[PDB]
Design a protein around this ligand. Structure first.
Ligand SMILES: Nc1nc2c(ncn2[C@@H]2O[C@H](COP(=O)(O)OP(=O)(O)OP(=O)(O)O)[C@@H](O)[C@H]2O)c(=O)[nH]1
Ligand SMILES: Nc1ncnc2c1ncn2[C@@H]1O[C@H](COP(=O)(O)OP(=O)(O)OP(=O)(O)O)[C@@H](O)[C@H]1O
Ligand SMILES: Nc1ncnc2c1ncn2[C@@H]1O[C@H](COP(=O)(O)OP(=O)(O)OP(=O)(O)O)[C@@H](O)[C@H]1O
Ligand SMILES: C[S@@+](CC[C@H](N)C(=O)[O-])C[C@H]1O[C@@H](n2cnc3c(N)ncnc32)[C@H](O)[C@@H]1O
Ligand SMILES: C[S@@+](CC[C@H](N)C(=O)[O-])C[C@H]1O[C@@H](n2cnc3c(N)ncnc32)[C@H](O)[C@@H]1O
Ligand SMILES: [Mg+2]
Ligand SMILES: [Mg+2]
Lengths: 1057, 49, 76, 76
């Protein structure tokens, strides 16, 4: 595909009409039509009108008389807005009626009409000698052979040339033209050579490689700058054309070498001529910016003038020293030959060198146009590094990058109202257990809960987490954009929570349109509002699970026992406006009206009862544990006595408090209270506060007491930390392979030349790093990169510092981002709950592994993409046995990581466990290598085989993660599980296939039957806080609801030998 | 006055660049004829919209 | 939870632009957008107009020439 | 007086947040002003300001005429 395929033709000659078409060329009869006769456009940003005639009129000199027409008065008439199409058309038409070119129509079919000379004559109003010649002999405009059309006016006038002014394409601007086109009487090649030679003796002139009408023409520039802009535009045209020719596509180029040839110019135009003729690779890669084309072009020459390549340098120099020569590739030259063959007397520029182009292998990446690049840095690369210099990152203005504290949680509205349950497990409550749990709860109360947990709970508020969403429902409703929703629907409740005004349906599934001029204020909500709504939804889902309508039944009542302004009471009262007869009242000790102000327990005289209650009592006052205990007890007691469906808060849900509550309900005469712990998704994600759910049932409740419950573990495992909480730093110095960085994120900017080096270094820490320039003009590239503990745990296993620097340098300068808009990074990015549970399990196993002495290696079977790498210490060797893992022999050899890349066999005899080894089986047992679910008996079987296989071993430690059965009991009763599911009795976490769950009792019983040491451990609250603090993660609401019940039912068996 | 403030914020004068682009001063100064042989041109006559 | 957790920073210094952003800091090309470039509000009870520029312009002394502009004639 | 008052409100809100153990992006640790030379009344504002009185957290003071209440608080 080397040879060019092209059909060169004098397009400008084809544009000239037959003499007979000249009479109607204005189309006097009909209005000009947009996109055919004219092309109007108004750029509002520039406030610049631009009209552009099509057809022959694209080349049209205007007489001052023509410029006196109102059409040209139009842009001044409408300084700030588009000319209405009616005025544009009517003025353009009346002006078209105004024009009449001189012509002598004739019957010869070979004849054409010299449009240029006719419109020119008309524009000068026939005062120039050409205009005289035309006004007296219009027939001279008609021509057969295109060249003779001018020869005829050259002989008849006796002049050697004619200076025709150029046309601006946009008929609106009246600005002085940059240059003009002289036309020479040179019929022969010889006459042309002489004119060219003489032209090289005079200032500021240039010409094309070939000419239209086969008549020589020269551009004469009014200044150097005009010559530069002209040469530049032509270089762009020639480069685009050649870019197309080299693709082997057929082209209808009007001329083979589109770019101009200086005959006499300054230095700078000679530079443009040189890089122009070079056809540099840099154009094709879009490495240059066309926003200020000539500038970049000049700069390009500057590189080539001193180019690292010898061939390209000497070639550019040689082209610079012979600017008058027209350098061209051999493939162009054959096209010039075909042209000279088809038209033997064609003129084309005679001084011409034919160079072989110099190949270059550097494929630069590039992309002008908005969009930051989100790099995923490789751990290693072909490039080696040795003692890399520290790379300072600049301060960034807030005009470019803002750093908000916590990422707001995008979510569906229904997801806000979900909740999870935790049913009681123990059938009895032994007194020694009571003393132990009481000592635990007292010790835990007297010394405050973890400071880091407090920091997260007080930083990641649910109110701000929901705010962008709740406001959005308000903003849509204010615009009237919202329309259809069911009466009892959760979307409806969200709407009542978003606006203060009462809503009303005009019919089924249709809210009433806003009255004109009415813009009701958004509903005012405190932090506990959405939570109280979600608790109400929870009670509605507990009275019967299948319900879709959430409206209270007629002739029923609810109480929100903890109260102040309690906006939720107002929202709920307005949500149920269409239901007849329903009490809805708050009742705090601080309660303001509508809510009654009253203490709990209720005064002995006052009568309080309801079908539902939602307590949220919480004493702000610091107090003795005994008083807190007696108060919470009396609150649960009065809450249970007053209603058939209490939903009491428990501020300090120790096993002792909850069990004392169960015992107290046991003590009440004649009623048996079924109960369940609960946690809505509208709670603050980190709060250990839990809502007990009291109901009466006729049956005595088997297993009523709690022991090792999830919601309880969320609180009890949290304890005062030894250390201060890990505040997220913003790093600004990228040290080379240092491993000193506290969790946080790199953020700043560098000169774009230094950018490939920066990405080369931060690969050591951050897994991935967004970058962008602010504009094509500003050389600094901004860079943001959150620090990944996993990447540190991988990269720092050895001292080698390889990277893909050689690839990252293919980005400079256009290949690493553009974004004018300010970007907003968060110190605590969102992550799905399963990911958080993964990181938690990793913190648990890693802390567990660091304690062990004298272990040669970590064997993580089913390790996927080195997911378990964070767990293993940098010193000991790491091993993976996941078939799905990709092989990187260089990365493996450089970073001390074997990869078996085969399906691990669970049969005991085939299995070979090394002594002094840590065997991770993190979520691998529950699936086959191909991803199909393995039935639970096979899972208990393979766990039994891993157990028996390590019986011979002296020092070995298995970590078999699995799914406990109890969760399916709890998720069947819960609502807040957007990720986790229960398809036909099997867990369906994330996108994974549904998978049957083991029962913990039979597993532990089997391990006792094997006699191997074992300890069923699960990650706790401090592990969660370590995960979030290290990875920079905020939990999120659905995650806060589901994480306790999910984490507790992913036990990690710890086999030990 | 408004158009004036927009014009004169750009600069009372400009210089043609070696690359050919205009570069306005961004300053509001009275012209002196000493400037006539200088690199600067009066900005009213730039014909840059 | 006694010890304070805080990240103190010279926010006012962070507000100051790079020299290269100064040319376009006005965003001459595009109209100012509500809630990003400016914050207009009319309190009908007080009958008091209140405009408040965002970004660097939140700190901006006006020349009397700037105060002669029709924009400031608007509330009257 | 009005300046010191607005600053006292800013410092009190900030400290009210710090004492909740939440991470804060405070631009400065003690938001309130220090008189170098002032009258009696500003010295009173400086004093109750530095006290961080419980009465602020309870909303016992009215912010409709902040400095006034602040002066009264000092009187108690
Ligand atoms: N006044 C006038 N000028 C013309 C006419 N036809 C061509 N020209 C000018 O003559 C110059 C030389 O013609 P071309 O060989 O087509 O040069 P060009 O720069 O490739 O023209 P473009 O098609 O605009 O790219 C051009 O700059 C045109 O502006 C015409 O009919 N009337
Ligand atoms: N891009 C170039 N191509 C060819 N010759 C050059 C180039 N740049 C400089 N020269 C040579 O150097 C001389 C100009 O010197 P110098 O480069 O210091 O200043 P300049 O003209 O502004 O160019 P630059 O912008 O590269 O500095 C010219 O006479 C020319 O011969
Ligand atoms: N709130 C206060 N704090 C400190 N000193 C006070 C205060 N109020 C009064 N004093 C002392 O008393 C003197 C003022 O007397 P007095 O209280 O009778 O009148 P005042 O200045 O109007 O104060 P007030 O408003 O409390 O009456 C001052 O010199 C001051 O030293
Ligand atoms: C955590 S607040 C939540 C109230 C409600 N959800 C709201 O914010 O609108 C609990 C309120 O209950 C009140 N309270 C505390 N103890 C109480 C008690 N023993 N009896 C009645 N109210 C009490 C407190 O004054 C506190 O303001
Ligand atoms: C849930 S993923 C990884 C879970 C966890 N993040 C980890 O790294 O341990 C489990 C992987 O183990 C692999 N796997 C499943 N069964 C296996 C088997 N019997 N032998 C070896 N690999 C297996 C699968 O390819 C799957 O990708
Ligand atoms: Mg052309
Ligand atoms: Mg300030």
């Amino acid at each position: 595909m080397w040879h060019y395929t092209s059909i060169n033709n004098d397009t400008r000659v084809a544009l000239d009409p037959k003499p007979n078409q000249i009479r109607t060329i204005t189309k006097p009869n009909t209005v000009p039509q947009l996109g055919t006769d004219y092309l109007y456009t108004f750029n509002s940003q520039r406030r610049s009108h631009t009209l552009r005639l099509l057809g022959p009129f694209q080349y049209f000199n205007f007489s001052e008389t023509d410029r006196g027409h109102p059409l040209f008065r139009l842009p001044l008439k409408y300084p700030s807005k588009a000319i209405p199409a009616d005025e544009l058309i009517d003025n353009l038409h009346s002006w078209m009626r105004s024009v009449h070119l001189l012509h002598v129509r004739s019957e010869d079919n070979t004849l054409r009409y010299n449009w240029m000379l006719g419109v020119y004559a008309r524009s000068t109003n026939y005062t120039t000698p050409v205009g005289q010649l035309v006004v007296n002999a219009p027939a001279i405009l008609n021509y057969s052979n295109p060249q003779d059309a001018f020869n005829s006016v050259f002989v008849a006038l006796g002049i050697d040339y004619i200076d025709i002014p150029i046309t601006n394409s946009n008929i609106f601007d009246d600005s002085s033209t940059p240059y003009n086109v002289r036309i020479w009487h040179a019929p022969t090649m010889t006459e042309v050579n002489h004119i060219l030679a003489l032209m090289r003796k005079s200032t500021l002139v240039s010409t094309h490689s070939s000419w239209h009408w086969n008549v020589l023409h020269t551009f004469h520039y009014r200044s150097e700058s005009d010559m530069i802009d002209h040469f530049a535009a032509k270089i762009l045209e020639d480069w685009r054309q050649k870019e197309k020719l080299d693709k082997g596509a057929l082209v209808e180029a009007d001329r083979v070498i589109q770019r101009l040839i200086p005959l006499s110019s300054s230095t700078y135009v000679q530079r443009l001529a040189a890089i122009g003729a070079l056809y540099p690779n840099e154009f094709t890669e879009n490495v240059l910016d066309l926003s200020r084309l000539s500038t970049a072009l000049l700069q390009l020459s500057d590189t080539y003038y001193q180019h690292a390549n010898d061939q390209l340098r000497r070639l550019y120099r040689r082209m610079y020293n012979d600017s008058r020569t027209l350098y061209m590739t051999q493939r162009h030259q054959e096209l010039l030959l075909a042209q000279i063959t088809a038209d033997p007397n064609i003129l084309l520029y005679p001084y011409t060198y034919i160079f072989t182009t110099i190949p270059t292998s550097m494929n630069y990446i590039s992309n002008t146009g908005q969009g930051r690049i989100k790099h995923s840095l490789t751990v290693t690369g072909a490039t080696e590094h040795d003692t890399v210099a520290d790379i300072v990152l600049g301060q960034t203005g807030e005009d470019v990058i803002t750093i908000s504290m916590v990422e707001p949680m995008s979510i569906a509205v229904e997801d806000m109202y979900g909740y999870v349950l935790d049913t009681p497990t123990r059938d009895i409550w032994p007194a020694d257990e009571q003393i132990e749990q009481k000592g635990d709860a007292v010790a835990l109360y007297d010394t405050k809960t973890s400071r880091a947990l407090g920091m997260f709970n007080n930083t990641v508020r649910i109110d701000d987490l929901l705010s962008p969403l709740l406001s959005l429902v308000y903003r849509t409703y204010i615009k009237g954009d919202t329309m259809t929703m069911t009466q009892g629907s959760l979307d409806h409740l969200t709407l009542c929570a978003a606006v203060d005004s009462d809503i009303t349906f005009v019919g089924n599934r249709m809210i009433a349109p806003l009255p004109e001029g009415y813009i009701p204020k958004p509903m005012h909500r405190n932090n506990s509002t959405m939570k109280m709504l979600s608790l109400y939804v929870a009670l509605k889902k507990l009275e019967n699970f299948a319900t879709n309508s959430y409206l209270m039944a007629p002739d029923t009542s609810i109480i929100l026992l903890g109260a102040e302004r309690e906006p939720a009471v107002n929202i709920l009262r307005r949500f149920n406006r269409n239901v007849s007869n329903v009490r809805i009242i708050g009742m705090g000790d601080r309660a303001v009206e509508p809510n009654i102000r009253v203490r709990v327990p209720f005064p002995i005289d006052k009568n309080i009862s309801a079908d539902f209650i939602i307590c949220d009592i919480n004493s702000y006052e610091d107090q003795s544990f005994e008083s807190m205990f007696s108060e919470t007890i009396s609150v649960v007691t009065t809450c249970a006595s007053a209603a058939t469906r209490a939903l009491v808060k428990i501020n300090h849900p120790s096993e002792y408090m909850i069990n004392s509550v169960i015992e107290r309900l046991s003590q009440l005469g004649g009623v048996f209270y079924h109960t369940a712990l609960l946690k809505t998704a509208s709670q603050n994600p980190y709060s250990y506060e839990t809502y007990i759910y009291i109901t009466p049932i006729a049956a005595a409740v088997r297993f009523p007491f709690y022991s090792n419950s999830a919601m309880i573990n969320r609180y009890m495992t949290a304890v005062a930390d030894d250390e201060m909480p890990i505040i997220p730093s913003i790093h600004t110095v990228i040290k080379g392979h240092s491993n000193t960085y506290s969790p946080g994120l790199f953020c700043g900017c560098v000169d774009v030349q230094s950018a490939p080096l920066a990405l080369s270094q931060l690969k050591s820490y951050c897994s991935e790093a967004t970058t962008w320039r602010v504009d094509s003009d500003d050389n600094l590239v901004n860079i943001i990169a959150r620090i990944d503990p996993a990447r540190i745990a991988l990269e720092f296993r050895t001292r080698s510092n390889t990277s893909a620097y050689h690839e990252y340098q293919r980005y400079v300068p256009n290949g690493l981002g553009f974004k004018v808009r300010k970007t907003r990074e968060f110190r605590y990015m969102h992550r799905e709950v399963t990911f958080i549970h993964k990181l938690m399990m990793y913190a648990l196993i890693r802390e567990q592994i660091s304690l062990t002495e004298n272990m040669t290696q970590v064997v993580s079977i089913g390790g996927r993409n080195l997911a378990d790498i964070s767990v293993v210490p940098l010193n000991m060797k790491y091993v993976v046995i996941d078939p799905a893992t990709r092989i990187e022999t260089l990365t493996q050899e450089k970073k001390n990581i074997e990869v078996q890349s085969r399906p691990f066999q669970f049969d005991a005899a085939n299995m070979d466990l090394e002594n002094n080894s840590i065997y991770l089986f993190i979520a691998v047992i529950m699936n086959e290598p191909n991803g199909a679910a393995t039935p639970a008996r096979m899972q208990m079987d393979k766990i039994r085989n891993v157990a028996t296989a390590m019986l011979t071993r002296t020092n070995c430690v298995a970590y078999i993660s699995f799914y406990e059965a109890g969760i399916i009991t709890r998720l069947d009763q819960s609502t807040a599980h957007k990720t986790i599911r229960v398809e036909e009795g099997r867990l369906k976490v994330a996108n994974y296939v549904p998978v049957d769950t083991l029962v913990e009792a039979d597993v532990t019983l089997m391990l006792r039957d094997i006699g191997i040491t074992h300890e069923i451990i699960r990650p706790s609250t401090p592990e969660l806080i370590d995960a979030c603090s290290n990875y920079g993660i905020r939990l999120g609401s659905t995650g806060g609801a589901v994480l306790d019940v999910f984490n507790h039912y992913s036990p990690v068996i710890k086999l030990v030998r | 006055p408004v158009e004036y403030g927009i014009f004169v914020q750009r600069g009372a004068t400009y210089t043609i660049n070696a690359a050919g682009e205009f570069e306005f001063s961004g300053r509001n100064e009275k012209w002196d004829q000493a400037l006539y042989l200088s690199e600067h041109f009066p900005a009213l006559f730039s014909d840059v919209p």
